[PDB]
C-alpha cells in the first residue's frame, strides 16, 4: 500500500492489471483478532418432549443387506439406473 504513485503506475502498467484494487497483502480490512463471544445454536434433538431416542435412532435403522439372489415371462431388460442425462454446455462461459 505504501508504494508511491510512480511505482504504483509502473507496476499497473507492467502487469496490465490494476493491482491496488486487489492487493495480496492484507491490511485493516481483515477481521479483528479479538472477537465477541459466540452463542452457538443447538441441534434439533435439544427438546424436552417428543424426543425419544428410539424415534430418531439412526444406527438401529440400518438393516442387513437384502439377499436378492442366493444359491442357498418376457421380462424387460434392465440397466443399473436410467442412463445419465447428457450434460448441457455452460450458459455462463462455454468457451464458444
Amino acid at each position: 500500500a505504501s508504494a508511491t504513485r510512480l511505482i504504483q503506475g509502473l507496476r499497473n502498467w507492467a502487469s496490465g492489471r490494476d493491482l491496488q484494487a486487489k492487493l495480496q497483502l492484507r491490511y485493516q480490512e481483515i477481521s479483528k483478532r479479538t472477537q465477541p463471544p459466540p452463542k452457538l445454536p443447538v441441534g434439533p434433538s435439544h427438546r424436552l418432549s417428543n424426543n425419544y431416542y428410539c424415534a430418531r435412532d439412526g444406527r438401529r435403522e440400518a438393516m442387513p443387506p437384502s439377499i436378492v439372489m442366493s444359491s442357498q415371462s418376457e421380462k424387460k431388460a434392465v440397466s443399473p439406473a436410467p442412463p445419465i442425462k447428457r450434460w448441457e454446455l455452460s450458459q455462463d462461459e462455454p468457451y464458444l
Binding site: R11, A14, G16, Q24, Q35, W87, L89, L96
Partner: protein, 176 residues
C-alpha cells in the same frame, strides 16, 4: 454445466494470421511474461522478519502439550486415562495411584512428542481441561530424548504457559 477449455479454432484472415506471426517473430507473450515478473519486482514482498516478527496464529493452535491446574494450585488431571485411550499415536502413557491424601492422581504421565501427531484429541477428550495443547511451537531440541516428556516437564509447561493457555481457552471454550 460444462465448458470446453482449448476448443478455439483461430481466425485465418490476414489480420489474425499477421497477429500470430507478429507474436511469433516479435515475442509478444514473452514480453508479457517479463512484464508480469517486473510487476512483482516493484511490489512490497510478503516476507515477515522472523524471529522479530511472528506468523499469525489463532487461539485454537495445537503446539506443545501442558498439564494444567485449578486456580488453587491443584492439578486438574484425575488419572482417568481418556487421553491415552483416544491418543491415535499412543503417545500418552499414564500410571496412577491414590496419593497421600487419598486423591485420584497420576504418578506417570508421559507424552512421547515424537509419536505425537498434534491432533488435539487429548484436549478434547479431557473432561477437566487438564491436558491441553498450548501455543508453543518453538521447542526444537538437540537430542531425541528431550522430546520424551514426563509429568514434570508437562507440569512445568503448564506453569510456564498458563497465563496464555487460560486466555486461549477463554477465547475458544464456547466453540467446544
Amino acid at each position: 454445466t460444462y465448458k470446453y477449455v482449448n476448443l478455439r479454432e483461430p481466425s485465418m484472415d490476414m489480420k489474425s494470421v499477421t497477429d500470430r506471426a507478429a507474436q511469433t517473430l516479435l515475442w509478444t507473450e514473452l514480453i508479457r511474461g517479463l512484464g508480469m515478473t517486473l510487476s512483482y519486482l516493484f511490489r512490497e514482498p510478503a516476507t515477515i522478519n522472523y524471529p522479530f516478527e511472528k506468523g499469525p496464529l489463532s487461539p485454537r493452535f495445537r503446539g506443545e502439550h501442558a498439564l494444567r491446574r485449578y486456580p488453587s494450585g491443584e492439578e486438574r488431571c484425575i488419572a482417568c486415562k481418556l487421553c491415552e485411550a483416544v491418543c491415535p499415536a499412543q503417545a500418552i502413557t499414564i500410571e496412577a495411584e491414590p496419593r497421600a491424601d487419598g486423591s485420584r492422581r497420576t504418578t506417570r504421565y508421559d507424552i512421547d512428542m515424537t509419536k505425537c501427531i498434534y491432533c488435539g484429541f487429548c484436549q478434547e477428550a479431557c473432561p477437566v481441561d487438564a491436558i491441553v495443547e498450548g501455543p508453543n511451537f518453538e521447542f526444537s531440541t538437540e537430542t531425541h530424548e528431550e522430546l520424551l516428556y514426563n509429568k514434570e516437564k508437562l507440569l512445568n509447561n503448564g506453569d510456564k504457559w498458563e497465563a496464555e493457555i487460560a486466555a486461549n481457552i477463554q477465547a475458544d471454550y464456547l466453540y467446544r
